[PDB]
Structure formats: C-alpha cells, structure tokens
Scaffold this motif. Structure first.
Motif: not given
Lengths: 200, 672, 96, 150, 150, 50, 50
Positions: G17-27
């Motif tokens: 996934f081209p992962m959104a940093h905003n949430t992925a760093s928490t996820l």
C-alpha cells in the motif's frame, strides 16, 4: 396433464375481460380509476393496439394490476424485477410474450387456398401420410409464402400472448397495493359492511 | 403508432424451407434444347391408352385425372425396395423454366389445388393449366402396324411463374439462362442470416446528444428547457451502465429488449478440441443388399459324398440373398456438422475484400450491400476445424472483426422474432425517454409544456445482424399519432394538496445525474498512424473521478447530431449504443499528462514509472502477469477502480461484483 | 510427430471501459476521490496532455476517450406550474 | 431416456435419378385406337428417367450419435478386465501411459443405448473409477488450453 | 428458424469406389511416337480404379432431425380427432388408452421446420392443452426412473 | 398393406415405428395420497382425553 | 516418458500500500503489542492420518 393440482398452469392467457360489478352498481373502481371505468380486460380485443404495451395486444388498464401486486411496477416507474422478487411461479419468469407473421388471406392474388396435403414442399423424401421411406420425387414448394429475403408477399401480424404458471394476482385496494393483512380498501370506511348481493 | 417496412434486407432464419431434404446440387425435372436428359416418375397406373393415366375403374366408367393436380410428390409406392411399375407419371417443368436445384425452390399454387400450374391461357376464361399429356414409350417397341407401343412413363410439363428466395448459387458452369444441359454442377448456397428490429432496450429511437431540435420541457408560464446536450456528452451509454446494478441485463422481456446484444462464448472464443468420432456410423443401402442371383436348392439323396443332385421341395429360384456380409456405407457424423457450423459462423461475419468476385452470376454495386456480401464464399480451410486444435484461443485473425453481429444474440435475435417476421407490420409499443433530468421526477400540479422530435433515418434507428444498410438498400418507416402514458399514484386528496410542501420550496430539489456523468472528445486515427495524443489549452476544471477510453469506428457511425446524414452507409453494431466496445484490447501503452508538465504517475509506484503498458507480448516473462498478456502496470489497475483489490492481496469476486458490463465477464485470457 | 515451436500469448478484453481512479491511493472511494478535490487539484487551472499508443491501425477509427466529468440538475418549483432551471458540468467549465 | 428418432433418416444418392433405361416417345394417329409408331418432334433416347421408387439408404442419426457419446465418454477409463490388446501390433508396455490402456481396444457393445435403458442409473463400475479423470473435464479444460497447445 | 447445413453431409460408400475398370501398362521405348507395346513391369490385369469423380450420397442432416424434434415430442401431443392412424392393423377403443394413442401418427410434413418460420411463435395448438403431457417435464423425469424401471 | 397371417409379399415393404412415451411418475411434491383437504376422509387428530 | 521440467528464474513480487504517514506511523506501533496480535484458522481444522 393438470393445471390446478400440479402448479404448472397454462390457461391464464385466454381471457377477454373480467367485468367486476358490485350489485349492478358502478363497478369495482368507482373513481374513474383506470383506462376502463366498467371493465377489466386481459386479452385485448383487436380494437386499439396502440394502447397495448410489450409488443402484443396486452392491455394497459390491466398491465397495472398484476404488475402491482407481487412487486410494485407502475407508480415509481416501469422497473426491472430481481431474481428473488420474480419467483419460479410468479408473474414474470415463466410468462414470455410471442408474435408471428407469414401470409395474409385478403391481400394477395393467387393465394386462394393452400391445402393440408395439396402442398408440394419436401415431399418424396417425406412421407405421404405414414412415416414410410422415400415415396415420390422432389418438386418445388408452395406452402410458406415468404416476405423474407428477396420476395414480396403482403402480410399482417397477429399479436397473441402466453401466460404459463403465472397466478392472476390483484391487490384489493383503491391504491392497488398488496401490503399488510388489513388491506387499503379491504377494511376501510364502508367496506367491512354487512352482507350485500354480488353479481359479476 | 404506425407501420414498419423491413424490405429485401433481412432473413431471421439461416436455412431453407423449400425442398431442403432433396440433394444440394440436383436440378428439378426439366428439358433443354440445342435433346433431353431429366425426368422423374412417382405416381402409379393400371393401363394407359389414349389419355394420361387411367388411375381407376370406378364403378362402370374409366376415369383419367385432370391436369391441375396429377403427380403429387407426397405419394410414391407402398414398397421401399427395387420394384418395377408398368405405368408411371411425373412432372417435368416446361422450357420457360431452366435447370434449377431443388434445394431452395418456391412455387405459386394459382389454382384451387396446391399443384401449381399456368396463369395464362386463351381468350374466354383463362383457367386450364397447360400440363402435357405426352407419354413416353420404351425401346421394346418401334416397328409394327398394330403392335403396342405402350408407355412406361408419362411426363407432365408445367409453365409456372416461379422465383428463388432462400438460395443463391455459389458455382455455376455456363452463362446460358434460358435452357441448358450445363447447369449440372449448379448447387445451393443459402443466404446469410440477418434480422432487423429495435436496437437493444429501445436505444437509438429518439435523439440523445442532438440539440438541433432538443427535448425541451417548458411551461405555459415557464420559458425554460430540460435538455442541454453536446457532442462531448453521453446519454446513449447511460441507460445501460447505470442499469447494470439493478439486475443482470439478460432477463426475458418484450417491450424493451431487456436481453442485450451478447456474443456466444462458444463462437467468438473457439472451443477447438476435435470431434467425438471414435466410432463409425453407417448409411446402409435400402434394407441391406441390392443384387439379383439365381439360387437353386440342393439336398443329398443318391449322391452320398460332397456332390448332391437337388432339394426335395424346391424354393422359388428368385433369391436376392448375399453370400457374404450385408453392405454399409461409412459416415463419420461428428466431423460433418463441425465443418458446417465452424466454417459458417467465422466466415459469415468477416469483412469482404478477400472474398469472391462475379462468376457467371448477377451481383450488386457497393461492398456494403446485402446481395454483394451474400454470394461470396471463402474456402473451408482456415475457418475449418484444424486451425489451432487443442487451444481455447481466438486467433489474431478473428479478433479485429465485429464480434456482436452473430447467429444468436440475447438482444438481436429476441426483437425481430417478436416483432413480426416480414416487411409490412401493424404493431404498437410504448417507446422510451431516457435523460437523467427527466427520470425519477414527481411533477407538481399546474400548467406545463412538453416538446420532442424523432430521428427519422431508417439506418440508425434499427440494427442489422450481418451489417447491411436499410436506407441505402430499400427501407422506409412511417409514423402516425404519438402518445404519452403517464402513470402516478392515486394519492389521498388531502395529502395530494399537502405533501407538495417539500417540492413547493426551492430548498430541496429532486437532483439527478448519470453514473457516467462524463464528457468525451472525438478524434480520428487512420491507417499507418498508430501514435495520436490529445492537446488541450489551459482549463479551469475542478473535480475529477478518473478516466475510461475505448475504440469507435468511423465506418459504422459518423459524428452524429441529427437524423439526416448521408455518411451512414452501414447498420452493424455500434460501440456507442449497445455497449459494443469490442476493440478494447487494442492498446499497447498509455501515458497521461497534465498542464505543461511531466506525465501523471510521477509519484513512482510501479515497475514502469510513466507509461502504463496495457499490452506487452513476449518482451519479458515477468512483465505480463499470470499468463495473460497484460503488464502489472495495468493488470492491478482494473481491480483497483471499483474493486478494492491490490493491497490486501488478490481476491476472487462474488457472484454480484461482476455486474455483466464489468471485467472478468466480458474478458478471458488465452494462449496458442 | 514432434515439431518445434515458440508460443504467442495474447489477451482478449471487450465491452468494458479502461477505468482508473483519481486519488493518491488510486482507489475510488465514494464519488469524489481524494485527488479529485485535494490541495493540488481543487480551484487552480491545469491542462491534460497525453502520450497514447495503440496496436497497429488498419481501418479509420475514432479513439473514444471519456474524461470523468460531473453534470447534475436541481428541479425547482417556487410556483405551482413554474420551473426554475439550473445545470452544471463542473470538470468541463459548466455549471450555475 | 431411449433414442428419440421416430422418423427415419436416409443417406440419399447423387440426384435420385440413376438407372440406364432408354426411353422413346409415342403418339396414335397412324393407328387411331390401339396401335402406335412414333411421336411428333420426338427427341433422342438419351433418357435416364427413374421409373418408380427412389433410393433411400437408411440411418438412425440420434442412435448413431448416442453411440459416440457413450463409447468416447466412458470406455477408455472403464476398468481393465474385458480390455485386451490386439494381435499383429506391438505396444509400449506401461498400463497408464499413452500406449497400453490408451490403445487397448474395448467394446461399445455394452456401453451403448441399451444398458439399463429408461433407468437413470450410474453404472457401479463408473462409480468405482474417477469421473474427474476422463477425456473432457472442466478443471483441466481451462488450463491445458490456457498454457499452449503442444 | 430453419436449419444450418451449408456444407453437404455425405454417407461415403464403402472404401471409396467399387465400379472399377481393368487397366493395362504401356512402354514409350518400343514406339517413340503414337505407338505403344507391352511394358517392362505391367500394372496388373485387375487395376481397381474408378477414374474421375467419387460417388456421393447427400444427407441434409439438420432438417430431418429437427423434423423429429417437432414430431415425436410436438406432433404427437395435439387435438385427438383430426390426428390420423393407418387403416389395416388391429387397434383398441379409447383415445386415452395406450393402444389407440401410440399407433396414432399425424403427418410428418405437417409439423416440420417450415410452419411460420422466422418468428419465435407458439400457435393456439399446444398452449390450450397443458405442457405436462409433454416429453419435456424435469419433475416427472426424476422419479419415473429413480424408484424403478419395470 | 395386407390382412394375411404372419407374412405375405407386400409385408416386405412393411415398416416399424416407436411407441408413444408415458412417464409413470409422481407430481412436483407427489401429493395424491393423503386426504388433506377432502371433507369426507379428513383427520380429527385430537388428544387422549379431549 | 515424454515430459521434462526446467524452470529458469524465480522472482519476488508483492502488492504493498502507498501508505499515508499520518496514520501508518501510529498503525505500525498499533500492531506492535502483546495485546494486538491477529490469529488465523481454517474452516476445516482437520488432522490427517494415513
């Protein structure tokens, strides 16, 4: 062959009109409700094919009765039924309309009569009356007068319909909606009234 | 309301109804002139002398039958085997009728009897059929005054007005049209099947994206409109793409052609895996054996050893018995029908240029005419069984052609078969109105105006199953009084005056749009120019859902915005109307670009960074994924749009995700 | 009868449109996707160019390309009988 | 459910007109009643006119095709007991392989339209063997044709 | 719709051809031009060769089968008084009984692949009689042969 | 063609033809045994006391 | 008898996934627990003995 006990009905197609009359007074509608103010036609007469829809003589005063009982198609729009709504013995699945055109009897010149065994189409190879082997020779055919391909023989189309296994559905409502046990016109102002004579 | 005329442009059936069980290349009994060869005899007799036949002694007076009906092809003889008849009678058509194959022969029964005869006779009451009572003797008698020259056959010549409809001959020997012996190799090729009626679910009946005369809804007070269409807009493609959700568009209904134009998966993609012929089948002669031999019975009495005299009670000498095995003529049935159907359905709907030109027969002018495409027959060899047997693979040969004009469609076949098989028809139906603005609207009471028009050209309004024109060939449609069947709910009159309050205010308004709310643009790509991009100046576009492109032919549709167009000379399947986007695979690589800057996918997410490779063949086994020619750049892309596949892994869709006009339904990967 | 060959594999694919979404994710979630009305593609003006390539052309054909635009109505009724009409194709400089 | 072919089918000859019988023409006026000589403007006796019943070389098409269906569809994966390899020909020796059982000849004189005819019953020896291991499948059909023919 | 038989189906006579003529060999050496004697290694005095064209037998296969499709399962379920039966053979009484309504056969030509051809049409011929007496039911198809067949 | 016993000349031209089929089977639910609706042979189906 | 197999190369591919940093760093840390641990099982968890 049995229509009633089996569930595979067939006779639903050949009915002219069901004139519902409550005690000889203004008919089952009584509000000018549909196209006909007294009658309920099923198989339309030859008079006015313009009113009939679905490429047949299927009248529209009733194409809003069985089309509005099991599934409401005739207020919100002429929509398409689902595979579940359209059951194995319901209005739509088994019923499939039909049409024909071959020869007209009053327009053509030499078309006086083409007989039953007077024909001469695929004879010789085909028997005279019994399934017997090659009896006769091959000679040009004369029965099916064509208006197809490279020919001109004037013809008129007949428009009969076919209703199979379908149950003649109708809601007992002024609104024509089959919803709930206490139906819209079944139990209304003066419709739970005492015993009155019925003649249809 | 009114009448329709199909013309000499159609054939719902592929075969023949006129002597279609007699041999293909065998001509009818008739005579030629320079001496005659042909003549046939079905009927029976007793003894013929001065009249045609004596067919019975009825009571006390002999009776000879009339010229009107005499040798009916129906009647022959009770026995099947080789039996001899003393007096026989058969028809042998007169010298106005040429040699013509039985397979496809129409005749006009002018008289009361079905036995077709003459039309013209003498002055008083022209009725009597000129059917010849000239009897035919045998070689047995020639000389002797008083000796019986008794006829074995009596032949009956007929001068009947006849025409050929269901067949048109592929191979003819010689030019002679009156009478000739040299029409022996003359056979029967049936006409190409094609049926003409309404385009699927009433499409192309009225104008859509045509505002010379617009579908304007005004008011007795209101000056305004409800149609604002352009060439860069779709309304024809709407009523199929949005309607894909509400059930599969295949269910059987007669008004709208609710079953839509759909090719056979067995026909377009060839299922070549040979034939089931592992056993021989047999066409035994009449009942076993055909031979006459004298066989006299024998039994021992005095001769004790091998040599015996004869039998005690001898059976009659005529014994038609084989000493050996009873004969059988071998046929392989499975391979015979396979040639018939596979050679047909591929070659029938192929563009005519390699196909054949005039050979001893009449032909039309233009290539797109019905009769020009009719008499053409390519060799059963490449279209035959043995092209690439053992591979479920539609070759590069077939895939370019118009794959929706076929023998059996769900759409095409259903309309014409319930319209009226023939030209002249009195038939009526409720007819469409499909704009997004007009659809699910509940009109307030008051005073209004409702104005429309129709596309009148016969060519565009009605489909063809081979791809042959109506307006250019010969067809015309006439209209009577058009109507409207408005249906609403019988609302409670207290509520019908008070429920309006929602639409009585300008706060809440019944808003509608197409699911493909898109705007297009048309640009031509000709031969020897495979690379064409789009250039548009600076533009203030705000929203965007995405992109979807496919191919349309200039040959089968022009830049339309009216009824009257001389450009439209075809009548085949159009991508814009029936969802007939057949040349979708014809894309090598796609690169998108914005306003004066580098191309779109710059955010680096795939193996190929800029250009979306749709097709890459044998370039590198690792670019085209899962044994399908499509590269990973576009393979993941299809299941990435409406489908949520390509991050969680790879999913196989449920029975409702594939709504008929979507991806796996349509397309299937192949190899050879 | 052992012969030698090199295969040709090719896909067939008709009757569906080549659909691609308009987001940084590149997945259509709803009607208006992320990049459809984002920070970069919202109110500013930009002009789409191309580099199309198709498999060899034989017959004169129009490459039908759809840009996913957005055209909606609203049916007004201030008076009974009188309609006020307003249309809007936004990603094509149309609306009001 | 039997062989539904109540009407006969015939492998009909070339044109139906095949017999070498020379025929002339006739007409009475030299002999008014019962005596004739020749016909007016009569043409030569190159006549090949068929006098009577035309040839019909019989076949039951629905029964002959049913033969194929039933002999090709099951008999080579039928149990190997009545199967015997033919003499005068030599075969490579391995039961399962493309030589032995593949060329081991068996009769359609049992697997035909007369074994338990009328009765819907899968024969107990078809049930003993794999129905998934036959000449026409669905699993192997969409892959062997998807890989490349050869 | 009618038929599909564009290519004629042939019932090939046995091994090809039988009506063959004897042939004898000739050498170009003895006579150089227009003179021929006995050859070195003769073609035998029984050279079974029919020269020219192969003898053909046309069976237009699609028509006579479709004829049966409208005969055995369509033409045999019609109004029962105009329906015909041969004159001679012994028969029972009632039209409902087996013996009278199995011998009864209407004309093979009457219900064939040419009645109102082109349109998807059903006449008022077998629609006012229930399609349950038909050879086409799937429900009766199951139990008729599932419990027994005798 | 001939009335004669067994066999006579013209019975060589005699032909055979299959019988009409009759599927002795049961209905879509095979109901036709129990008297469910019939007013005569109906079932009481009550208690040991009541 | 007839067939011979030789594969040339093995290549890794996977769908990230081209992962959104905003949430992925928490996820990423969200999965990084003793608590948040995801267990898998079959529809038929059957033990085989031949």
């Amino acid at each position: 062959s049995i229509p009633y006990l089996d569930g595979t009905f067939y006779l639903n197609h050949t009915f002219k009109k069901v004139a519902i009359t409550f005690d000889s007074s203004v008919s089952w509608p009584g509000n000018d409700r549909l196209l006909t103010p007294n009658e309920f036609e099923i198989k339309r007469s030859v008079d006015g094919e313009g009113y009939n829809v679905a490429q047949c003589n299927m009248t529209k005063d009733w194409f809003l009765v069985q089309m509005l009982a099991n599934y409401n198609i005739g207020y919100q729009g002429f929509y398409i039924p689902e595979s579940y709504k359209d059951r194995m013995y319901s209005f739509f699945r088994n019923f499939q309309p039909m049409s024909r055109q071959v020869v007209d009897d009053t327009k053509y010149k030499d078309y006086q009569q083409v007989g039953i065994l007077h024909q001469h189409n695929n004879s010789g190879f085909v028997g005279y009356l019994a399934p017997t082997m090659r009896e006769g020779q091959a000679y040009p055919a004369n029965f099916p007068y064509p208006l197809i391909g490279k020919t001109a023989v004037d013809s008129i189309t007949q428009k009969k319909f076919l209703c199979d296994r379908t149950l003649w559905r109708i809601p007992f409502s002024s609104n024509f909606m089959s919803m709930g046990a206490l139906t819209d016109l079944g139990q209304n102002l003066l419709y739970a009234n005492s015993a009155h004579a019925l003649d249809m | 309301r009114g009448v329709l005329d199909r013309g000499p442009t159609f054939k719902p059936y592929s075969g023949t109804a006129y002597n279609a069980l007699a041999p293909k290349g065998a001509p009818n009994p008739c005579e030629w002139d320079e001496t005659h060869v042909f003549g046939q005899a079905p009927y029976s007799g007793i003894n013929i002398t001065k009249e045609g036949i004596q067919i019975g002694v009825e009571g006390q007076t002999p009776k000879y039958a009339d010229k009107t009906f005499q040798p009916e092809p129906q009647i022959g003889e009770s026995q099947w085997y080789e039996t001899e008849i003393n007096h026989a009678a058969g028809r042998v058509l007169k010298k106005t009728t040429p040699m013509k194959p039985c397979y496809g022969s129409y005749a006009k029964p002018t008289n009361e009897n079905g036995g077709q005869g003459i039309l013209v006779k003498q002055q008083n009451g022209k009725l009597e059929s000129q059917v010849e009572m000239q009897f035919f003797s045998t070689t047995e008698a020639t000389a002797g005054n008083g000796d019986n020259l008794t006829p074995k056959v009596v032949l009956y010549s007929e001068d009947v007005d006849i025409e050929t409809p269901d067949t048109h001959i592929s191979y003819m020997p010689t030019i002679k049209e009156g009478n000739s012996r040299e029409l022996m190799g003359q056979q029967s090729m049936p006409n190409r099947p094609n049926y003409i009626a309404f385009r699927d679910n009433f499409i192309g009946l009225m104008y859509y994206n045509s505002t010379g005369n617009m579908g304007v809804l005004a008011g007795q007070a209101s000056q305004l409109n409800a149609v604002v269409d352009l060439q860069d807009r779709n309304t024809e493609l709407s009523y199929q793409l949005l309607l894909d959700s509400i059930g599969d568009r295949t269910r059987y209904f007669s008004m709208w052609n609710q079953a839509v134009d759909s090719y056979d998966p067995d026909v377009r993609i060839i299922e070549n895996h040979g034939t089931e012929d592992e056993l021989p089948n047999y066409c035994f002669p009449l009942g076993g054996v055909i031979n006459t031999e004298t066989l006299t019975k024998v039994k021992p009495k005095t001769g004790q050893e091998n040599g015996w005299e004869k039998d005690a009670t001898e059976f009659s000498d005529k014994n038609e018995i084989r000493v050996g095995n009873n004969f059988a003529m071998e046929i392989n049935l499975n391979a015979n029908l396979w040639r018939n159907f596979l050679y047909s359905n591929i070659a029938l709907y192929l563009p005519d240029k390699l196909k054949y030109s005039p050979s001893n027969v009449k032909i039309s002018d233009n290539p797109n005419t019905y009769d020009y495409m009719n008499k053409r027959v390519v060799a059963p060899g490449l279209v035959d069984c043995y092209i690439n047997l053992g591979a479920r693979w539609s070759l590069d040969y077939m895939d370019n052609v118009n794959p929706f004009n076929h023998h059996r469609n769900a759409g095409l076949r259903y309309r014409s078969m319930l319209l009226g098989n023939g030209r002249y028809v009195p038939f009526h139906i409720q007819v469409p109105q499909k704009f997004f603005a007009i659809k699910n609207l509940l009109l307030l009471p008051g005073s209004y105006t409702y104005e429309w028009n129709f596309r009148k050209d016969v060519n565009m309004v009605l489909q063809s199953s081979l791809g042959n024109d109506l307006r250019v060939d010969g067809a015309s449609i006439k209209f009577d009084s058009i109507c409207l069947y408005a249906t609403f709910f019988p609302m409670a009159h207290n509520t019908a005056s008070t429920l309006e309050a929602m639409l009585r205010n300008d706060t809440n308004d019944q808003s509608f749009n197409d699911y493909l709310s898109a705007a297009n643009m048309l640009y031509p790509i000709p031969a020897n120019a495979t690379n064409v991009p789009i250039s548009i100046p600076s533009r203030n576009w705000a929203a965007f859902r995405g992109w979807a492109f496919t191919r349309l032919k200039t040959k089968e549709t022009p830049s339309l915005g009216s009824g009257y167009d001389p450009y439209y000379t075809y009548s085949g399947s159009i991508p814009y109307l029936d969802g007939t986007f057949y040349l979708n695979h014809t894309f090598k690589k796609v690169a998108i670009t914005f306003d004066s800057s580098v191309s779109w996918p710059g955010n680096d997410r795939l193996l190929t960074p800029n250009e979306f490779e749709i097709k890459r063949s044998v370039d590198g086994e690792g670019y085209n994924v899962a044994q399908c020619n499509m590269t990973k750049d576009w393979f993941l892309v299809q299941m990435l749009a409406n489908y949520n596949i390509g991050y969680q892994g790879f999913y196989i869709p449920e029975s409702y995700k594939d709504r008929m006009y979507s991806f796996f339904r349509n397309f299937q990967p192949m190899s050879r | 009868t052992a012969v030698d060959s090199i295969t040709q594999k090719k896909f067939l694919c008709d009757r569906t449109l080549w659909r691609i979404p308009f987001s940084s994710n590149f997945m259509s979630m709803g009607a208006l996707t992320d990049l459809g009305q984002n920070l970069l593609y919202a109110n500013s003006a930009h002009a789409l160019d191309m580099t199309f390539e198709v498999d060899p052309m034989d017959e004169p054909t129009l490459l039908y390309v759809l840009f996913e635009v957005f055209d909606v109505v609203r049916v007004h009724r201030p008076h009974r009988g009188v309609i006020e009409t307003v249309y809007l194709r936004t990603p094509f400089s149309a609306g009001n």
